[PDB]
Design a protein around this ligand. Structure first.
Ligand code: NZ7
Length: 171
């Protein structure tokens, strides 16, 4: 059975309980914390690519009002984000299962940009999601996993200083 688990969930939960924020910039900003995923139950000898994308958790624009995050009243459809390919991809089941799969190099932007960077809408709430794509084999296969613990609002600067403090304390 293919098992997908979040490394350092206790750390992510500290951020989640304050409402997590991730900086987006024109040129793209790396995430902290970094999404790290424990994977077991792969075929050590089969071939897989690991894909990361961001689901809009709701259709609303958020705003920090009197020290609290609040949704707008005017929802809009949120197009799914573009996918980031883990740079170790493609690779053998054994490679992926030998240490936590770390997305340390993904960069979050607010501008349609060249290559690599994933564009997110500022002040939208997002839920990180991976796809494990079996490649090369005759039977293509995808398994998807969401990480509720890693939800965040995309921001151009931190609103909640409690988040600023946690980011510095644990970097
Ligand atoms: C680019 N890359 C390293 C890939 O893994 N490729 C190859 C080209 O695009 C499709 C996929 C994405 C996952 O399935 C195969």
């Amino acid at each position: 059975e293919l098992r997908v688990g979040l490394e350092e969930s206790e750390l992510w939960l500290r951020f989640k309980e304050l409402t997590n924020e991730m900086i987006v910039t024109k040129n793209g900003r790396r995430m902290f914390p970094v999404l790290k995923v424990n994977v077991s139950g792969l075929d050590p000898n089969a071939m897989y690519s690991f894909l990361l994308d961001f689901v809009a958790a709701d259709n609303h624009r958020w705003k920090y009002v009197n020290g609290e995050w609040v949704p707008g009243g005017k929802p809009e459809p949120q197009a799914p984000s573009c996918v980031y390919i883990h740079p170790d991809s493609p690779n053998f089941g054994a490679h992926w299962m030998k240490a936590p799969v770390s997305f340390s190099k993904v960069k979050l932007t607010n501008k349609l940009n060249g290559g690599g960077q994933i564009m997110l809408n500022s002040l939208h709430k997002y839920e990180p999601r991976i796809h494990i794509v079996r490649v090369g084999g005759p039977q293509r296969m995808i398994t998807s996993h969401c990480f509720p613990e890693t939800q965040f609002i995309a921001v151009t600067a931190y609103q909640n200083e409690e988040i600023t403090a946690l980011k510095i304390k644990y970097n």
